[PDB]
C-alpha cells in the first residue's frame, strides 16, 4: 500500500536534503538518494513550483502511477504533502536511468537491451490497455526508463501523465508537454495527446537502444535514420552491438522495423504497444 510519510523522516533520511544525497535536479524537481528509517532504499523527488506546475505534476503521479503497480513500472512507495512542499518516494533503481547507462557506466549486451525494450514496452502497454481509464505518459524518455538490480526496465516519471477514458481516441489538454527530440509531430499542430503519441516517444527510445546515440544527433536522429533507411541500414546500428554477433543483425533489423513503425508521422499508422509486444514475440520465435 501507499504510505503517508512524515516530512521529518524525508528530511533526516537525506541529511537535511544535503547535496551529497542529490542525484538529479532541474526541471520538475530534485531527486535524492536516501534510506528510510525502516531500511528501505528509496529515491525522493522534491517538487518545486508548488501550487501550479508543481502541484499538477504531483497530482498527475498520485492519480496514475500512485494507484497502480506493475513489474515494469517504477513503484511509488510513498508521498508527502505539507504546506507548499510536495515530495514523492520511489523504490531505488540501482542502475539509474537508461540514459545514464547508455551514456557515461555499465555494459549492455543485446540480450539485455531487448529485455529492456520488451519490459518498457510491456509497461506502456499496461498503461494503454490494461488500465481503465487509460493512462497517457506524455514524457517517455530514455531518462524516464529506470533500470533495477536485474537490469529490468521500469518506466518512470508520471509527472505529466493524464487520464483518458477508454471510449476516446485522444485527449485535448491545456498545454504542450514533452521533451525535444521525443515529441510526436502532431503534438505541435494541436493541443491533443494520445496513447499513439506515447508509441512514437517509445520508438525514439527503441532507437537509442539500437543506435546508441542521443535523439538530438545529428544534422535529428529520427530523420537521419529515415533517410539512411533508403541507403545502407548496416551503417546505422550500434557498433558495440555488432561485435557480439554479426548473424544477429536479422533480428536487429526486425526490431528496427518495429521502431520505424512507431515513428511514423501518422498516428493512425503507428502500432499499439500490444502490437509492439506481439511483434517482439514473433521475432524471437
Ligand atoms: N527511483 C529512482 N532510482 C534511481 N534513480 C532515479 C530514480 N528516480 C529518478 N532517478 C534519477 O533522477 C533523474 C530525474 O528523475 P525524474 O523523475 O525523471 O525527474 P524529472 O525532473 O521529473 N524528469 P524531467 O523533468 O523530464 O527532466 C532520472 O533521470 C534518474 O537518473
Ligand atoms: Mn525525467
Ligand atoms: Mn517530469
Task: Name residue 32's beta-bridge partners.
Answer: 22, 44
What is the domain-level CATH number for residue 145? 1.10.510.10
Query: Which is it for the CA torsion 53, 55, 56, 58, positive or negative?
Result: positive
Query: Measured between alpha carbons, how far is 36 from 13 in angstroms, rounded to an integer?
Result: 6
Query: How far is residue 111's CA from residue 125's CA, in Å, rounded to a whole number?
Result: 21
Q: Per the structure block, which three cell numbers stand in for 146?
A: 529506470
* Cβ atoms of 57 and 159 closer than 8 Å: yes
Closest by CA to 37, choosing from 3, 65, 85, is 3
Cβ 139 vs Cβ 179: under 8 Å: yes
Same domain, 42 and 124: no
Indicate if 63 and 131 belong to the same structural domain.
no
Residues 114 and 186 in one domain: yes
CB–CB of 126/120 below 8 Å?
A: no
Residues 6+ apart with CB under 8 A from 58: 47, 50, 81, 86, 88
Q: Which three cell numbers stand for residue 222?
A: 529520427
64 lines ligand 1 (CB under 6 A): no
Q: With contact defined as beta carbons under 8 Å apart, do 44 and 34 qualify?
A: yes
The C-alpha cell at 56 is 499538477
Asked which of 68, 92, 116 is the last residue of a domain, the reply is 92
- C-alpha cell recorded at residue 198: 506515447
Distance (angstroms) between ligand 2 centre and the Cα of 53 equals 15
Which residue has a Cα nearest atom 10 of ligand 1?
Answer: 96
Domain residues for the domain of 123 are 93-285
Whether residues 87 and 35 share a domain: the answer is yes
Exp. method: X-ray
Residues 191, 97 share a domain? yes
Cβ(136)–Cβ(109) below 8 Å: no
Q: How many domains does the chain contain in total?
A: 2
Q: In which residue are the cell numbers 508537454 written? A: 177
Same domain, 113 and 210: yes
Asked if residue 116 and residue 246 are part of one domain, the reply reads yes
Cα distance between residue 139 and residue 184, in whole Å: 10
Last residue of a domain, one of 63, 92, 121: 92
**Entry resolution in angstroms?**
2.7
Q: How far apart are CA 274 and CA 83, in angstroms?
A: 42
Please check whether residues 245 and 137 belong to one and the same domain.
yes
Give CA angle at 122 (121, 124), nearest 5°: 65
For residues 27 and 54, the answer to whether their CB atoms sit within 8 Å is: no
Ligand 1 binding pocket includes 93 (Cβ within 6 Å): yes
Q: What is the 3-state secondary structure (H, E, C) of the chain?
A: CCEECCHHHHHHHCCCCCHHHEEECCCCEEEEEEECCCCCEEEEEEECCCCCCCHHHHHHHHHCHHHCCCCCECCEEEEEEECCEEEEEEECCCCCEHHHHHCCCCCCCHHHHHHHHHHHHHHHHHHHHHCCCEEECCCCCCCCEEECCCCCEEECCCCCCEEECCCCCCEECCCCCCCCCCCCCHHHHCCEECHHHHHHHHHHHHHHHHHCCCCCCCCCHHHHHHHHCCCCHHHCCCHHHHCCCHHHHHHHHHHHHHHHHHCCCCCCCCCCHHHHHHHHHHHCC
Active site residue: 20, 38, 139, 265, which one? 139
143 Cβ closer than 6 Å to some ligand 1 atom = yes
Place of cell 537509442: 208
- The candidate with the shortest Cα–Cα distance to 58, out of 34, 78, 36, is 78
Q: Which three cell numbers stand for residue 242?
A: 555488432
* One domain, residues 138 and 150: yes
Domain boundary among 47, 67, 92: 92
- The minimum-distance atom of ligand 1 relative to the CA of 143 is 29
C-alpha cell at position 71:
513489474
Q: Do 231 and 248 belong together in one domain?
A: yes
Residue 68 Cα to chain centre, angstroms: 16
Same domain, yes or no: 47 and 61:
yes
Q: Give, rounded to a whole angstrom, the gap between the first and last alpha carbons of the chain.
A: 38
In the block, residue with C-alpha cell 508543481 = 54
Helix 195-211 vs helix 273-283: crossing angle, to nearest 10: 40
| 284 and 185 in a common domain | yes
Amino acid at each position: 500500500p501507499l504510505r503517508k510519510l512524515a516530512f521529518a523522516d524525508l528530511l533526516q533520511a537525506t541529511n537535511g536534503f544535503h547535496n551529497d544525497s542529490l542525484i538529479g535536479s532541474g526541471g520538475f524537481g530534485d531527486v535524492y538518494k536516501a534510506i528510510l528509517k525502516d531500511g528501505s532504499a528509496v529515491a525522493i523527488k522534491k517538487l518545486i513550483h508548488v501550487s501550479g506546475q508543481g502541484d499538477r505534476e504531483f497530482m498527475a503521479e498520485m492519480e496514475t502511477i500512485g494507484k497502480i503497480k506493475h513489474r515494469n513500472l517504477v513503484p511509488l512507495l510513498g508521498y508527502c504533502k505539507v504546506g507548499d512542499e510536495r515530495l514523492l518516494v520511489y523504490e531505488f533503481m540501482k542502475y539509474g536511468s537508461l540514459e545514464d547507462v547508455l551514456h557515461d557506466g555499465v555494459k549492455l549486451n543485446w540480450s539485455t537491451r531487448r529485455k529492456i525494450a520488451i519490459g518498457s514496452a510491456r509497461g506502456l502497454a499496461f498503461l494503454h490497455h490494461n488500465c481503465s481509464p487509460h493512462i497517457i505518459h506524455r514524457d517517455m524518455k530514455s531518462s524516464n526508463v529506470l533500470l533495477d538490480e536485474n537490469l529490468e526496465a521500469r518506466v518512470s516519471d508520471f509527472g505529466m501523465a493524464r487520464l483518458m477514458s477508454a471510449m476516446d481516441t485522444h485527449l485535448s489538454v491545456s498545454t504542450l508537454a514533452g521533451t525535444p527530440g521525443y515529441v510526436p509531430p502532431e503534438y505541435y499542430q494541436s493541443f491533443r495527446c494520445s496513447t499513439k503519441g506515447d508509441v512514437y516517444s517509445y520508438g525514439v527510445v527503441l532507437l537509442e537502444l539500437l543506435t546508441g546515440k542521443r535523439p538530438t544527433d545529428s544534422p535529428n536522429l529520427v530523420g537521419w535514420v529515415k533517410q539512411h533507411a533508403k541507403l545502407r541500414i548496416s551503417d546505422v546500428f550500434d557498433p558495440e552491438l555488432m561485435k557480439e554477433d554479426p548473424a544477429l543483425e536479422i533480428e536487429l533489423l526486425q526490431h528496427l522495423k518495429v521502431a520505424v513503425a512507431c515513428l511514423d508521422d501518422r498516428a493512425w499508422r503507428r502500432p499499439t504497444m500490444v502490437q509492439v509486444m506481439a511483434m517482439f514475440k514473433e521475432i524471437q520465435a
